[PDB]
């Protein structure tokens, strides 16, 4: 029976409501404060658990993050490997929400970057780039050098440097999940002329399909890595290694788009869970799209992620 | 001549210093290089410095239970905390401060318990001096000034308008009830601008700053929106201070020469305000109060942190 390990981040997002973005030398009083749990690790782990899979999160928070740990636990995330680091704070995004509409963000890595694991009980590894890359590399290498090798899924967010991308051990990767702009960052770092980030909507699907094939056949990459490219409201592109590139449209929404926050983390978590359930690849993707549809119809990051029953009720 | 006792009506903050390359610009995302969390708040900082300077002081305000370690830090320094309430289901006020490598800082305040006002709505019976800022609700600051000014005899009340009040609030402010206004050059400009002046002492060049601030003080003194009984202190950072006693000349004193490199200038203004009130409380002459303030502030900027860099009176005496 399948079990996923997420090696990734936990963030508290702090929205300070302000008349205007604070200027240098200025003291200004916020008129309200909203907190939202986040982080690519925590979001995607939450989605895996909401989709019904057994998942554990490997990372660190501060004492100020226990309420997020409890939120993950309540959703079924294993948090036994979620360490509390004294004298560090949970990763933080300090967001200034101005009445001008203009926003400004300050990111603080915090306990996500704390650097002081047997993978034998795990079948899947989920990683991103919001913890130290050495940690992600070490976990990815360990998944690939296991007997048998673990199914590993990588979401390069935030994007790695061109130097980091070219020296990345892609041979150890079962799945790469990106959006069209992140696909363009990889192709650009690998000498490609095309960047499907600046594509027009009419060209997007075809140019991103071509970018997937080109990345597959690029010397810096590996030919054994499956590639999923998410396209927001246009859907997803999927390349199974050695098959043909498939397009699936986004699920038809039953409600207005409220908020697209967490849509890609919702996809990643539901995808790993679909792999763990032994479903066909296409059926795992279909469940992702329906889950992501519910996700963009609801407010919040984690809070918007539907339960499998909710996904099945729509299906 | 009675024993001096100071009531500080003001804020307690948990300060979060995010170390950044520059102050974040609208639309930009930027990563901090480090975070320092420390006790702060204008009320707590200034009350702390009064206690360090040897004065009898009590802080009147509110924290949340997440702030009890700040309350204990104040008690250890000799700040009286019986009137620092702990409000259930409330968090201590916060300052989110961008500390740029450039040098400039930017502060976002979250009021938290600092804006707790019991319903319904205090005696000033044993107090001679009242110190107030603007990090609690203005009605509370005003009610305390009214009470200080309506005592017999009236309390010596000192005001540091931080953060700056709105133009309307400044024009209806009871300046007649104030003994001392403590400001920096930028704040001096805010009052002047709110009172119909064209003078902009903050926007002056470094070569002319002392002269432009000196005139701005004399202009503020003579303004019909202000009051002629209020003494004015304008701090000028590394350039020193300006002092104005009503009807006298504006006096300039330079900053103390440092005996160690600059480590951190945060809290120097609050260190000054607290030492100034304590100097008044001791019955020292005004020049000796200011001279002690300057030496205290020289020590302050040689050390890290806001409260923790404030020297004890004995430490200041070793330099004098
Ligand atoms: N506007 C939208 N309408 C419908 N579905 C959406 C919308 N935005 C996102 N989704 C769904 O969520 C998935 C992931 O969204 P996407 O924007 O590509 O993620 P990312 O945050 O990585 O950019 C999409 O492939 C789609 O199924
Ligand atoms: N860079 C500095 N070098 C030396 N003394 C300083 C420096 N900055 C501040 N001080 C001392 O601290 C006092 C108050 O600092 P200032 O910057 O004017 O306060 P505020 O934070 O209220 O603007 C100054 O008058 C001076 O005596
Ligand atoms: Na998108
Ligand atoms: Na200054």
UniProtKB/TrEMBL annotation, chain A:
<protein>
    <recommendedName>
        <fullName>Ribokinase</fullName>
        <ecNumber>2.7.1.15</ecNumber>
    </recommendedName>
</protein>
<feature type="binding site">
    <location>
        <begin position="39"/>
        <end position="43"/>
    </location>
    <ligand>
        <name>substrate</name>
    </ligand>
</feature>
<feature type="binding site">
    <location>
        <position position="300"/>
    </location>
    <ligand>
        <name>K(+)</name>
    </ligand>
</feature>
<feature type="binding site">
    <location>
        <position position="179"/>
    </location>
    <ligand>
        <name>ATP</name>
    </ligand>
</feature>
<dbReference type="GO" id="GO:0004747">
    <property type="term" value="F:ribokinase activity"/>
</dbReference>
<feature type="binding site">
    <location>
        <position position="179"/>
    </location>
    <ligand>
        <name>ADP</name>
    </ligand>
</feature>
<dbReference type="GO" id="GO:0046872">
    <property type="term" value="F:metal ion binding"/>
</dbReference>
<feature type="binding site">
    <location>
        <begin position="11"/>
        <end position="13"/>
    </location>
    <ligand>
        <name>substrate</name>
    </ligand>
</feature>
<feature type="active site" description="Proton acceptor">
    <location>
        <position position="265"/>
    </location>
</feature>
<feature type="binding site">
    <location>
        <position position="232"/>
    </location>
    <ligand>
        <name>ADP</name>
    </ligand>
</feature>
<keyword id="KW-0963">Cytoplasm</keyword>
<dbReference type="GO" id="GO:0019303">
    <property type="term" value="P:D-ribose catabolic process"/>
</dbReference>
<dbReference type="InterPro" id="IPR011611">
    <property type="entry name" value="PfkB_dom"/>
</dbReference>
<feature type="binding site">
    <location>
        <position position="259"/>
    </location>
    <ligand>
        <name>K(+)</name>
    </ligand>
</feature>
<keyword id="KW-0479">Metal-binding</keyword>
<feature type="binding site">
    <location>
        <position position="130"/>
    </location>
    <ligand>
        <name>substrate</name>
    </ligand>
</feature>
<feature type="binding site">
    <location>
        <position position="261"/>
    </location>
    <ligand>
        <name>K(+)</name>
    </ligand>
</feature>
<dbReference type="GO" id="GO:0005737">
    <property type="term" value="C:cytoplasm"/>
</dbReference>
<feature type="binding site">
    <location>
        <position position="230"/>
    </location>
    <ligand>
        <name>ADP</name>
    </ligand>
</feature>
<feature type="binding site">
    <location>
        <position position="265"/>
    </location>
    <ligand>
        <name>substrate</name>
    </ligand>
</feature>
<comment type="subunit">
    <text>Homodimer.</text>
</comment>
<feature type="binding site">
    <location>
        <position position="298"/>
    </location>
    <ligand>
        <name>K(+)</name>
    </ligand>
</feature>
<comment type="similarity">
    <text>Belongs to the carbohydrate kinase PfkB family. Ribokinase subfamily.</text>
</comment>
<feature type="binding site">
    <location>
        <position position="295"/>
    </location>
    <ligand>
        <name>K(+)</name>
    </ligand>
</feature>
<feature type="binding site">
    <location>
        <position position="304"/>
    </location>
    <ligand>
        <name>K(+)</name>
    </ligand>
</feature>
<feature type="binding site">
    <location>
        <position position="235"/>
    </location>
    <ligand>
        <name>ADP</name>
    </ligand>
</feature>
<feature type="binding site">
    <location>
        <begin position="230"/>
        <end position="235"/>
    </location>
    <ligand>
        <name>ATP</name>
    </ligand>
</feature>
<feature type="domain" description="Carbohydrate kinase PfkB">
    <location>
        <begin position="5"/>
        <end position="307"/>
    </location>
</feature>
<dbReference type="InterPro" id="IPR029056">
    <property type="entry name" value="Ribokinase-like"/>
</dbReference>
<dbReference type="InterPro" id="IPR002139">
    <property type="entry name" value="Ribo/fructo_kinase"/>
</dbReference>
<keyword id="KW-0808">Transferase</keyword>
<dbReference type="Pfam" id="PF00294">
    <property type="entry name" value="PfkB"/>
</dbReference>
<comment type="function">
    <text>Catalyzes the phosphorylation of ribose at O-5 in a reaction requiring ATP and magnesium. The resulting D-ribose-5-phosphate can then be used either for sythesis of nucleotides, histidine, and tryptophan, or as a component of the pentose phosphate pathway.</text>
</comment>
<dbReference type="GO" id="GO:0005524">
    <property type="term" value="F:ATP binding"/>
</dbReference>
<keyword id="KW-0460">Magnesium</keyword>
<dbReference type="InterPro" id="IPR011877">
    <property type="entry name" value="Ribokinase"/>
</dbReference>
<keyword id="KW-0630">Potassium</keyword>
<dbReference type="GO" id="GO:0005634">
    <property type="term" value="C:nucleus"/>
</dbReference>
<feature type="binding site">
    <location>
        <begin position="264"/>
        <end position="265"/>
    </location>
    <ligand>
        <name>ATP</name>
    </ligand>
</feature>
<keyword id="KW-0067">ATP-binding</keyword>
<comment type="pathway">
    <text>Carbohydrate metabolism; D-ribose degradation; D-ribose 5-phosphate from beta-D-ribopyranose: step 2/2.</text>
</comment>
<keyword id="KW-0539">Nucleus</keyword>
